[PDB]
Structures are given as structure tokens and as C-alpha cells.
Amino acid sequence: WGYGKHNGPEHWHKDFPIAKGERQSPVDIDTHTAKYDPSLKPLSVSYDQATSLRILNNGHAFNVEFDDSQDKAVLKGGPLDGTYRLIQFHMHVGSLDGQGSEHTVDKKKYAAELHLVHWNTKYGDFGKAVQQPDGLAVLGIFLKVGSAKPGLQKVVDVLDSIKTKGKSADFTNFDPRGLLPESLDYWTYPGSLTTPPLLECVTWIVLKEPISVSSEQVLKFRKLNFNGEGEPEELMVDNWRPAQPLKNRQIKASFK
Ligand SMILES: [Hg+2]
Ligand SMILES: [Zn+2]
């Protein structure tokens, strides 16, 4: 699987029939039909003691992995029940500033979308969590081009080390709090992982407020490669899945 004409999103259902399931992601967020829900508590993001380990290019995206042996960087509150541990974060980026995000707001696409993946501690490990309808919580952050996001520069600086598929580099002492917008207002709905295996185990929390990155920063996020060292160069751009039918789901908004 990949993002090409021959193994891209339209071909996934052949190996993962769940691609055609009832709670697939991403979806388009129609701001007018989203239900404001007051009973939604505010999100509680506690990343003060987070511990990043490595950054790697897996041929699908760059991923920053965190030590999730204990509750050091967790997500609680909002529509969640229980504590969810941060396991990793990755980015989907487009080839042009007008595309790149997976979720769309009223059909509007952003330049990129950051996904911070969390798993429900009541399940013990990540592997068990992906067997439960409420095993994961993914916080989605939109990116638009504007001013530079200093909190992302550390990632930008190291992309040289992990240019090709399979490369990895130590990436300790990285603070994920630097990736957050000022506001934590969000939309939430039950969905799935957006890459194979596409398991429907995710409670999506998509932040209303995008963050900005400079054009120079986004230029560098577009210089990674899907290919392995020594293969023809295929730039890692447009690694995103198109919106899926909402079907029998309602999107809730934590704000009006
Ligand atoms: Hg599941
Ligand atoms: Zn993702």
C-alpha cells in the first residue's frame, strides 16, 4: 500500500475490506451541521513530562515515537473516558499549499495535518487497544502557511537524517506542547486510523484552530522520500487519504 495510482487509497479495500466500513476517517466537517454539545468537558492535555525517543521515516510519513511505559504525556477529558497515553505523532502534507490535510472543514483543505496518537491505558498496551472500539484517541491539528512555528523547527532541522524509508534518528527531549494552538476547542466523532489497517478504534479530536508554519518550514517537510536509499526518488508528498462518508455518525463541537 501507498499513495500512488497503483496502491493508493482507492486500492486499499482489496487488502483491508474495512476501508469500506461504517466509521472510516477522515471525514469532512460541515460546521453548520455539527452539534454543539455542552456536556463535553474541556480537553486535558498533560505533556509536561513527555519523553520522545526517536524520529523515523517509515516510507509513509515521518513519526516521532515517545516512551509510553508510564503516564508521562497523557490526554484526558473532552469526550474521553480514561487516560490515553501519547505513543507517537506524524504528519500528512500536500504537494501544494491548498492540499495536505485529511480532515476538511466545509470542504476546505489545509496545507498539512499533524496526528498525535494516544492509546487507552485500561487496555495495557497499544496492541490490545486496537482491538477495542474505544482503544485510541487521535488529536488532529491543521497547519496553514504563515509565520514560523519555533516548536516545529527542531523536527525540521533533523529531517536530513531520515530522508529515506527505514532511516531513524535519536530524537530525545522534544516537547510536544510546542505543537499546540492557543485554543483547545475541538470537534469530535468516532472514526478510524486513516492508513492501513484502518481499524475503527479511534475517537477523533480535531482542533478548530490551526497552527502556522513558514513557507520555508513546509518546504522542508516536502523534501522527504517514500523510497528507500538507492531507489528512484519519490518525494513524500500528498500522503493523505480523501474524506470518507460520515454515514450514521454525528460530529460534536465543544464550542458555539
Ligand atoms: Hg477497534
Ligand atoms: Zn495520520
Side-chain angles (χ1 to χ4, degrees), residues 90 92 102 115 194:
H90 58 268
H92 300 268
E102 297 204 298
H115 289 163
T194 65

Side-chain angles (χ1 to χ4, degrees), residues 8-232:
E10 61 288 335
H11 295 269
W12 293 352
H13 72 101
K14 282 175 281 170
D15 278 304
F16 310 93
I18 196 66
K20 294 194 166 192
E22 209 285 301
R23 49 178 292 195
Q24 288 295 290
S25 294
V27 295
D28 175 57
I29 296 158
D30 182 358
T31 63
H32 301 286
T33 59
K35 217 294 172 64
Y36 167 48
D37 183 350
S39 75
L40 284 173
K41 312 315 298 138
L43 273 173
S44 180
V45 188
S46 319
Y47 293 169
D48 57 282
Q49 249 308 327
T51 316
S52 56
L53 303 164
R54 284 195 329 176
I55 182 164
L56 75 149
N57 171 348
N58 63 12
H60 298 114
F62 76 70
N63 304 265
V64 174
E65 297 149 325
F66 293 77
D67 171 23
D68 64 344
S69 61
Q70 300 145 264
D71 290 356
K72 292 165 311 300
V74 304
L75 188 58
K76 314 164 300 308
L80 307 176
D81 270 80
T83 304
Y84 287 70
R85 283 188 193 148
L86 177 60
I87 186 164
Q88 60 108 307
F89 91 75
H90 58 268
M91 174 182 291
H92 300 268
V93 195
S95 51
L96 300 171
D97 293 357
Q99 61 189 56
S101 68
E102 297 204 298
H103 285 87
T104 49
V105 181
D106 291 326
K107 298 300 176 71
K108 185 186 182 310
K109 299 174 162 79
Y110 285 85
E113 189 173 328
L114 232 30
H115 289 163
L116 318 214
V117 185
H118 308 72
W119 61 270
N120 200 332
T121 58
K122 74 175 116 291
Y123 300 120
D125 67 57
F126 183 84
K128 303 296 174 303
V130 304
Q131 290 169 19
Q132 308 292 155
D134 59 343
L136 307 187
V138 183
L139 185 54
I141 306 175
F142 293 125
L143 276 70
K144 60 169 203 59
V145 180
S147 53
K149 173 60 86 165
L152 222 27
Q153 193 57 33
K154 308 178 71 280
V155 173
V156 169
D157 287 328
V158 85
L159 293 181
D160 249 353
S161 314
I162 57 142
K163 185 167 188 192
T164 44
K165 169 205 283 277
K167 295 299 186 188
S168 59
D170 184 86
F171 201 62
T172 52
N173 303 115
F174 176 77
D175 193 340
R177 289 181 305 190
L179 302 176
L180 304 174
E182 288 186 3
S183 185
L184 299 191
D185 289 333
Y186 60 87
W187 287 284
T188 186
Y189 76 94
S192 77
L193 291 166
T194 65
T195 55
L198 305 154
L199 305 175
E200 308 186 328
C201 306
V202 187
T203 286
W204 276 96
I205 299 160
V206 180
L207 302 185
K208 174 177 74 180
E209 172 179 351
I211 56 170
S212 289
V213 289
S214 66
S215 52
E216 295 96 359
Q217 289 186 307
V218 69
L219 274 188
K220 299 182 194 191
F221 283 119
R222 295 190 182 130
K223 299 200 177 183
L224 278 338
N225 286 175
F226 279 137
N227 58 284
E229 198 190 342
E231 290 174 37

Side-chain angles (χ1 to χ4, degrees), residues 19-24 27 244-250:
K20 294 194 166 192
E22 209 285 301
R23 49 178 292 195
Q24 288 295 290
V27 295
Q244 299 300 311
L246 190 62
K247 298 180 145 124
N248 216 306
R249 291 174 285 171
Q250 179 187 96

